Amino acid sequence: MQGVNIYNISAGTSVDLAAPVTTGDIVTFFSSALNLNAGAGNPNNTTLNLFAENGAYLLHIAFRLQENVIIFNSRQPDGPWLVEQRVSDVANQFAGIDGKAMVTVFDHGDKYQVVINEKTVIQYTKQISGLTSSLSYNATEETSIFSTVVEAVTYTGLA
């Protein structure tokens, strides 16, 4: 049955989904703030993650202002990071809207489509497959580009 679930992710924490995200489902992260002038990351300023049942990082979205790039990657929980995909000009991806932002991920089965507000910044070919059982938003209190609490909304049972 189609459903909507809402989660409040505080910076530096994760949440387990009550309804898993699989092929055809959607997850949108909402930030009630946007600080594109934050200091240097360590190396990341902000990261958004979708975890599989087995603990794998299905999709890792990392925003690095200092390197002016958004990174997309995957990795096993006990393995190394795999092949990174990069999008240049972080600030430009959020152009049009200020004071807040929205990041959407579509699980298309063999790929993850990431959209910043209304702009699809990448069709990321999966390096690791499976359904998402957990999410996390990692960042410090001083250098995150998003608010202290990031809200995640999932639309599941779509297919």
Next chain:
Amino acid sequence: MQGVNIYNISAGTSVDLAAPVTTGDIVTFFSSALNLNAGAGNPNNTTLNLFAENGAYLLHIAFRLQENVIIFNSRQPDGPWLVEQRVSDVANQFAGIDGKAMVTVFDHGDKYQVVINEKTVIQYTKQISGLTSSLSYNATEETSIFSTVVEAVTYTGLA
């Protein structure tokens, strides 16, 4: 293709969609406020609408505090209001979240599934079919249960 579109609807206005919403698509209205003590409507306090290309109300969602009900209906532009589907106890539907709210509409072709926050309030069997080409949020700045501006986010091209 799958896409995300954002619209800011000021009370009493409507917007034409850049991407029409059809079977398998989703639209969520976000309110940055929630006043269940707004007072008696005239008769409605707030309405959210999905219009067909010809102006027909495909889905009319009316929040009526004085009657303590949420009304769902449809009608042709020159026709009478059709059969109302009433959900009682407005406060219960928004329970769990204060200060704001979100109303989601799933277009399943034969029905419109409406979800307030995480709670599915109705599986509205359509009385009129067709694609949604426009949306509206109607209310006065005096008695609306939502903020002056409501943001509509559509997820289209899903099917």
